[PDB]
Design a protein around this ligand. Structure first.
Ligand SMILES: O=N[O-]
Length: 83
């Protein structure tokens, strides 16, 4: 059984003009290149976004697809909490 918390958190923050953004927090920024992971997810979703301050930010609400997309990048789906 899993011996850690649901350490990759995915949640929504407000953007302007009635839009929203998806935040992915908890990917180890020391070990992995969050800029690169952001670029990959941006390309898969054709959306804007950035990596900053230890988090990835994506334009729009991508909670519907984020577990599949992070699993395409090898992340364990049990570590991912979509909030
Ligand atoms: O972020 N302004 O909704």
């Amino acid at each position: 059984v899993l011996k850690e918390q649901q350490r990759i958190k995915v949640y929504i923050e407000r953007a302007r003009y009635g839009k929203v953004k998806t935040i992915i927090e908890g990917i180890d920024e020391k070990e992995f290149d969050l800029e690169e992971i952001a670029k990959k997810l941006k390309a898969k979703l054709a959306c804007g976004g950035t990596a900053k301050n230890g988090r990835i930010e994506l334009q729009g609400d991508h909670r519907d697809r984020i577990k599949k997309l992070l699993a395409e990048l090898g992340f364990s789906e049990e570590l991912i909490e979509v909030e």
